[PDB]
């Protein structure tokens, strides 16, 4: 039942995202209400989060692949829908596998940007 509910919610959010993409194409992004903005952000994360690195492409693309277990998939998408991961950057979901990958890539992004600040602050 949880799997079915999560799948339907994702489909509903994606459909709403397409509708919101049409309004911003006319009214503008600033015209969306507070709820619509949150829906857009969550949907964009979902779209970025649906991409996976295949182990078969390790040689060509270099990046190590991921095999996401079903239990992880339901929990990872369920948490995103509720809004638990509303503070993670959008790009942390692009071509990553599982929720844990989203977090480690956030560490590597937060720590990476930390050096950039000490550089840009200095110099």
């Amino acid at each position: 039942v949880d799997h079915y509910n999560v799948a339907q919610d994702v489909v509903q959010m994606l459909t709403k995202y397409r509708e919101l993409q049409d309004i911003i194409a006319v009214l503008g992004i600033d015209e969306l209400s507070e709820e619509d903005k949150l829906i857009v952000d969550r949907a964009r994360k979902l779209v970025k989060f649906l991409s996976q690195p295949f182990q078969v492409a390790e040689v060509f693309t270099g990046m190590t692949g991921h095999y996401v277990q079903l239990d992880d998939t339901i929990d990872s998408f369920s948490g995103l829908l509720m809004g638990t991961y509303d503070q993670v950057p959008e790009m942390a979901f692009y071509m990553v596998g599982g929720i844990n990958s989203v977090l480690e890539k956030a560490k590597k992004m937060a720590e990476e940007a930390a050096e950039l600040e000490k550089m840009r602050r200095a110099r």
């Binding site: 638990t84 991961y85 503070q87 993670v88 929720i99 844990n100 977090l103 956030a106 560490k107 930390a114």
Partner: peptide
């Protein structure tokens, strides 16, 4: 008022999520 009177895998994700966001606040500070 009476209510006030009376009073592991998921932990790793909460730990990482908290710690992940910890550096995100620190970078903003300095």
């Amino acid at each position: 008022e009476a209510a006030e009177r009376n009073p592991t895998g998921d932990n790793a994700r909460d730990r990482l999520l908290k710690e992940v966001l910890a550096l995100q606040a620190r970078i903003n500070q300095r």
